[PDB]
Symmetry: C3
Subunit: 273 residues, 3 copies
């Protein structure tokens, strides 16, 4: 038995403003500043790459979810109380940008797929988080907006890329040129979110969707994600990586089992973790 | 100004490129195409102008294709045809690359050159009853690279092939559905809708608006997250006069009054 | 009973899948034949458009043929050759000089989707079913097939399709942009023929040049690319335009001759 520690350590671990819950085959990145409607702070951004790494290193985890817990919001934009710190100097502002880019890139490049489950406010950094995920499900009543234009800022290259790829140039320009807040219904219509469900059911829907993906070959799921990311970043049909990834399709432990299951006339029981 | 087949109206914070050949339903002529880069430049140089609109005025059409009366002249020789192509490309590229955003407000016929004009704009709103078509295939021509690129980016390969392979005329409803236009509004209200939409964009940071357009164009022409120009554009976000004000306004809990022009 | 064939009925050529007893499940010999059929259609001057459909099997293509699984995947080398063979077939369809329209009824799964996405245009009947299932076997969808899917439906929808391997309806396929037209059940072939008729009526020089321009732009051409510029300029110096220009001056219908 590992040492049970102290109340202060326990309280510190619960009050972390973002955390990773493990419930195999899921890991859940839970935004956990409910008293500020999950407005994104420095320490939240700083923690994300570590949480993503933890989920990816745990073999019981197949899929990662990202959601707002019981805050009643996904993320209500940036925390205005930190504005004075993050923008005090050019250096602090630059570091803020890097910290955010690292968090978003870590989510985007996660070996394991990431599903965002969105209720209530999903604004600014919230949209950026959501778009870094592979898949997005939102409850009715959720609200979306990207607002650097209301501040005199510009949305970064990565965030803009991810948005463009989902909604196209016209819709991206509308969103960013106006900074307007729009409904889940419009988000669905624009292609910003992939599924629209009944209010308060996004998390359950994400879990069931994740369950479906978890049931198939995880070798395939992860390879698929690499293939897609590869193609988005310039791979062609001739690219050696793309060819070898395809050929590894026939040489991996899941296909070995899939092939055996087809011959034995039984369900496949995939083992790749 | 009212005899001019195309003109620029200034009504701060808007500039409006108004097509004005109502007797040919704004069919595009050499002198219209030739004037466009100058009108765009004028709008971009005027600090009172934040947004540019393109529309068909009171002709009842956005643009009813090419002017048939000039066909003979433009295509008489290989040289004339080449010059026509260059002139049109210059007009469309000028619109596309406008530092300030451009919104097309479309009523009635939007055919051929009309679609090209519309796709060069950043944003498109059309009234119901507007009609769309791209018809070089009906003549033995090919739609240029730039025009094709812009169409592809909006509607995707399948839809682009449908449009160009058939040369068919389709409704505003279908155009909306395909992603060719961004907004579909009640017939006769496209201009008003474009003005209000432009109003919304005008109210925010114009530093941001213009930077956003550069970032997007950059990403479309090969920029990555690592590209130096993309990084410096982002960092200039924290160093510009609008952000200084935006930051203050967020802390004071008042509307931002942005000054960058 | 050839398992795949080319029917000529000017101005159409039709690539007809014809293994009804397996609901047109795709085999080695089907894949191997495709580049030749495409070449035949393209070389025949009476042919303007190519259709691809499942004939009277009641299905477009019901995935891969399970009976050849053992052979194709017996070794790394066989599997690699399979991949090359399939890629050649799909690339031949995609790069066809003449446009290709897929007419889809019933099952369109796996290789079926790959075939459909290689075509330029897709029309499906209601009741058609779609799915891409390499994930259910431990395989990965190839680069070319994935590219073509992405370009039509976007990253989110592509991930949904491939991560789940789920079977979805023609209605959802239409909604996702996977197919271009959705028609009444059992009418996809007739709809494809009429659509092909419309395209056949205009300049085939333009149709083919348009396709090259688009493919060019997708594979890295810019407005400055020499091939893009010369393709545009050839628009004014081909036999169809020469006729189109004459017809305009004479005030008569154009009768295009390029084939």
């Amino acid at each position: 038995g590992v040492d049970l520690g102290t109340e202060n350590l326990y309280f510190q671990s619960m009050t972390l403003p973002i955390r990773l819950d493990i419930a195999a085959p899921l890991a859940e990145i839970v935004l956990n500043k409910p008293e500020r409607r999950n407005a994104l702070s420095v320490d939240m951004w700083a923690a994300i790459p570590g949480l993503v790494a933890e989920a990816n290193a745990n073999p019981d985890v197949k899929l990662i979810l990202i959601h707002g817990g019981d805050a009643g919001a996904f993320a209500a934009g940036a925390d205005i109380s930190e504005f004075e710190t993050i923008y005090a100097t050019e250096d602090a502002a630059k570091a803020s940008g890097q910290r955010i880019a690292q968090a978003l890139d870590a989510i985007e490049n996660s070996e394991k797929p990431v599903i965002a489950a969105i209720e209530g406010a999903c604004v600014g950094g919230g949209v950026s988080l959501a778009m870094a995920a592979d898949l997005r499900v939102a409850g009715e009543g959720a609200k979306f907006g990207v607002t650097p234009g209301k501040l005199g800022l510009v949305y970064p290259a990565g965030d803009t890329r991810r948005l463009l790829a989902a909604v196209g140039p016209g819709a991206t320009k509308d969103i960013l040129f106006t900074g307007r807040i729009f409904t889940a219904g419009e988000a669905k219509s624009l292609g910003l979110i992939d599924r629209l469900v009944e209010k308060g059911t996004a998390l359950e829907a994400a879990r069931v969707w994740a369950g479906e993906i978890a049931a198939i070959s995880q070798w395939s799921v992860r390879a698929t994600k690499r293939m897609i990311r590869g193609l988005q970043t310039g791979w062609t049909d001739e690219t050696p990586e793309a060819q070898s990834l395809f050929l590894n399709g026939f040489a991996n432990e899941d296909f070995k089992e899939g092939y055996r299951a087809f011959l034995d006339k039984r369900p496949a029981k995939f083992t790749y973790r």
